[PDB]
Write a protein that binds this ligand. Structure first.
Ligand SMILES: Cn1cc(O[C@@H]2O[C@H](CO)[C@H](O)[C@H](O)[C@H]2O)c2ccccc21
Ligand SMILES: Cn1cc(O[C@@H]2O[C@H](CO)[C@H](O)[C@H](O)[C@H]2O)c2ccccc21
Ligand SMILES: Cn1cc(O[C@@H]2O[C@H](CO)[C@H](O)[C@H](O)[C@H]2O)c2ccccc21
Ligand SMILES: Cn1cc(O[C@@H]2O[C@H](CO)[C@H](O)[C@H](O)[C@H]2O)c2ccccc21
Ligand SMILES: [Ca+2]
Ligand SMILES: [Ca+2]
Ligand SMILES: [Ca+2]
Ligand SMILES: [Ca+2]
Lengths: 121, 121, 121, 121
C-alpha cells in the first residue's frame, strides 16, 4: 500500500510506489483541501462551478484529484475509488495529479492526502 | 458490502447492512454533492467556512459525512476511511449521517453516494 | 438452507451462501415490508401502481424482491419461488436485491426476510 | 476459428461458432466502424467521451465490442484479446455484442468485422 501527499502546485504530480498490473483491484481514498488559485479551497472533487479552460483531465472539475496509470491518459479519482479495476491494456506506475491547466500550477496551494492499496481478488 | 446514498435531509441517517464487529477492518468511499440549506453544494468533507451551530459531529464540518457504530457517538467519515479499525468497545450497525444541526435537516438537498465493505483482517 | 434479510436501501444487495448450480431446484420464501421512498410500505411484490423509471429489474414492480445468480441479469423473486429451476446456463451465488432505480436508493427503508433452500431433484 | 460481422443494431448479438471450453486460450481481433446514434462512427473501443447511461457492459465505453461466453456477464473485447483465458467457471458459445443501452439499439449503424481463434496450450 502507499500513503502520501499530492501537492496542488506540482504540475508533474506525485509518482506513487503502486504499479498497477492487469487484473489488479485497487482502493483509493483521498482527503484534504486545495486551490487552483483563489483564497478559497476545495476538496478532491474540485470546484463544480468552474469552467474547463484546458484542464489535464476534461472528465473532472478543476481542482479535482486525477491519476495516470503508466502513460495512460488522465483518469478521475476525485474522493477515491472503491475496489476498482482499470480498463484493458492500462498498466504501470500510478501517478497522482491535481487537475489544473498546464502552465498555471504556480499559484496553486494546499494538497491532498491519499491512500492506495491493492485489494483481494 | 453496502452501496447506496445518504440523503442530506435524512436526520435519522441511513442504517447500512454493515455490522461492525471488534477487529473488523473497513473501507468507506464517499462521493457527491449536498447542502445544509444554500443553493451551493459541498462534497463529503462539508463546508470548511461554516460555523458549528450545534452539529451532531463537532469534529467535522457542517455538511460532512459522519457515522455512528451501534449507539456510539458520531465519528467523522468525510471522503472515506481506508482500512480503518474502530476504537475499543465500539460495535454494531453502521449508520451514515449528514452533519447538520438537529431540527434543521428539512431544508437540506442532495446526497452522497457511499460504498462500504469489510476488508481482509 | 439460508435465512437472512435484505435492506431496501442497499444497491449492492445481500450476497447469500447459496450457490445455484445447473439443474438445481430451489425454493424461496420472502416476507416483510419496505419502501422505495413513500411513507407507505409494500410487500415483496412491490408497488403494482408504480411506473418503471429505470429499475434494475424491468420484469418486476418497483419495490419488489429480485435476485442475481452469479453475474446473471436480474430475476424476479417477489414473494418467492416454489421448486424453481433457472433458465439454462445460469450459475453462481444468489444475491438478493431490492428493485429500484440505481442512484435512487437513498430514500428507501425497510427490508425483506428471506429463506432459501435446495429441493430434491 | 471464426470470422464474421457484428451489427451495431443487433441487440441480441452475433452468436459465433466458437465454444469456449475450460482451459482454452483465445485470440480475438476486431475492426471497423459503428455508431450508437450519431452521424459519426467509432472503432471497437467505442466513444471514450460518452456517458454510461445503462450500458450492457459497464466496463467498456458506449459503442465498444463486448461478448458473452455462454450466459456469462458481459466481457469487454474492444479491439481484441491476445492469448486470453476466461475467468473461473466461464464457458460456452461466444456471442459478440455492440455495447449500447438496452432498448436503444434501433438507431445504431455500422458493424465490426471480427476474427476469433484458439491458441496453443
Ligand atoms: C475563470 N476563472 C479562472 C480562475 O482562476 C484561474 O483558473 C485557471 C484554471 O481554469 C488557473 O488555474 C489559474 O491559475 C487560475 O488563476 C478563476 C477564479 C475565480 C473565478 C473565476 C475564475
Ligand atoms: C450562518 N449560516 C447558516 C446558514 O444555513 C443554515 O445553516 C444551519 C447550520 O449551521 C442549518 O443547516 C440551517 O438549516 C441552514 O439554513 C447559512 C447560509 C449562508 C450563509 C450563512 C449561513
Ligand atoms: C413517479 N413517482 C416516483 C416516486 O418515488 C420515486 O420513485 C423512484 C422509482 O421509480 C425512486 O425510487 C425514487 O427514490 C422515489 O422517490 C413517486 C411517489 C409518489 C407518486 C409518484 C412517484
Ligand atoms: C448523451 N448522449 C446520448 C446520445 O445518443 C444516444 O446514446 C444512447 C446511449 O448512451 C443511445 O445509444 C441512444 O440511442 C443514442 O441516441 C448522444 C449523441 C450526441 C451527444 C450526446 C449524446
Ligand atoms: Ca492555478
Ligand atoms: Ca439545514
Ligand atoms: Ca427510492
Ligand atoms: Ca443507440
Amino acid at each position: 500500500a502507499w500513503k502520501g501527499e499530492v501537492l496542488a502546485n506540482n504540475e508533474a504530480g506525485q509518482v506513487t510506489s503502486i504499479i498497477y498490473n492487469p487484473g489488479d483491484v485497487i482502493t483509493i481514498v483521498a482527503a484534504g483541501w486545495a486551490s487552483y488559485g483563489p483564497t478559497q479551497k476545495w476538496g478532491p472533487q474540485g470546484d463544480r462551478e468552474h469552467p474547463d479552460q484546458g484542464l489535464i483531465c476534461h472528465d473532472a472539475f478543476c481542482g479535482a484529484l486525477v491519476m495516470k496509470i503508466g502513460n495512460s491518459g488522465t483518469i478521475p479519482v476525485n474522493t477515491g475509488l472503491f475496489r476498482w479495476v482499470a480498463p484493458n491494456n492500462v498498466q504501470g506506475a500510478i501517478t497522482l495529479i491535481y487537475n489544473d491547466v498546464p502552465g498555471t500550477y504556480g499559484n496553486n496551494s494546499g494538497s491532498f492526502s491519499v491512500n492506495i492499496g491493492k485489494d483481494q481478488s
